[PDB]
Each structure stands twice: as structure tokens, then as C-alpha cells.
Amino acid sequence: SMNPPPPETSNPNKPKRQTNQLQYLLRVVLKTLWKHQFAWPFQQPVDAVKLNLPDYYKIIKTPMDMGTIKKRLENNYYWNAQECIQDFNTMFTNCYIYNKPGDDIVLMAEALEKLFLQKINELPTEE
Numbered sequence: 001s002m003n004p005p006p007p008e009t010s011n012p013n014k015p016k017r018q019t020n021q022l023q024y025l026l027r028v029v030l031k032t033l034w035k036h037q038f039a040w041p042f043q044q045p046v047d048a049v050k051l052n053l054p055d056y057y058k059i060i061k062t063p064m065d066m067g068t069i070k071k072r073l074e075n076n077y078y079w080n081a082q083e084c085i086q087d088f089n090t091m092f093t094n095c096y097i098y099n100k101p102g103d104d105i106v107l108m109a110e111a112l113e114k115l116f117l118q119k120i121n122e123l124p125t126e127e
């Protein structure tokens with residue numbers, strides 16, 4: 001029940017790097033999913049307290065949300081686009097695990113994972 005501490009967004013000793021693709025993940029991919037009608041549930045960590053889901057963090061062990069993605073991008077916390085894409089994947093996977101097919105939150109996710117996959121089909125090249 002009690003809310004764990006969010007995932008970190010800055011880490012002095014982690015190798016950081018700004019690539020063209022990482023720039024794209026924030027400027028085009030993150031910031032177009034953000035505006036979607038179904039983004040809001042995923043714009044910050046899940047508050048198992050506010051929602052009264054004391055079991056969320058007992059089932060979800062790697063939490064992830066577009067809020068901590070947007071914070072990680074803007075902090076250039078990532079080394080390459082793939083680790084940022086992995087955090088999106090974890091976010092969706094989390095939602096399909098704690099929930100079951102047909103739930104409204106899954107519908108929002110399944111959709112967002114569709115929009116996400118369509119937007120990252122074509123990433124920029126490196127200089």
C-alpha cells in the first residue's frame with residue numbers, strides 16, 4: 001500500500017549521452033503520447049494510495065511512467081534510445097500484468113503502445 005520511492009531521474013555516476021534519436025524520443029515521441037486522451041493515467045507514477053490499490057507495488061516490482069521518462073529524457077539520463085524505449089516497454093508490460101484484458105486502463109495502454117510503436121518505427125539517424 002504505502003507508496004515506494006519513484007524511479008530515479010538523475011544519477012551522477014551513470015554514463016549519459018545525448019543522441020539525435022534520444023532527442024527525437026522526447027521531442028516527437030514522448031511529447032505526442034503526452035497529449036493523447038489516454039495519457040493522463042500514465043503521466044506520473046501510480047499512487048497506490050490515492051487509488052486504494054494496496055497490492056500494486058506488491059505485484060509491480062519495476063515501476064515506470066511517462067512522467068519519469070520525461071524527467072529522464074530532459075535530464076539526459078539515458079545513454080541510447082534503446083534504454084528509453086525499454087522504459088516505455090516496462091510501463092506497458094506493467095499495466096498488462098497487474099490488470100487483465102478488457103480493463104479500461106489496458107485499453108488506454110494498448111492504444112498508447114500502438115501509437116508508440118507507430119512513432120518509433122522510424123527514428124532519426126546519427127551524425
Ligand SMILES: CCS(=O)(=O)Cc1cnc(Oc2ccc(F)cc2F)c(-c2cc(C)c3n2CC=NC3=O)c1
Pocket residue numbers: 040041042043044045046047048050051094095098099104105108
Ligand atoms: C498515476 C497517478 S494517479 O493518481 O494514480 C491517476 C490514476 C487514476 N486512475 C488510474 O487507473 C485508471 C486509469 C484510467 C481508467 F480508465 C481506469 C483506471 F482505473 C491510474 C492508473 C495508472 C496505471 C498505470 C494504472 N492505474 C490504475 C490501475 N492499474 C494501472 O496500471 C492512475
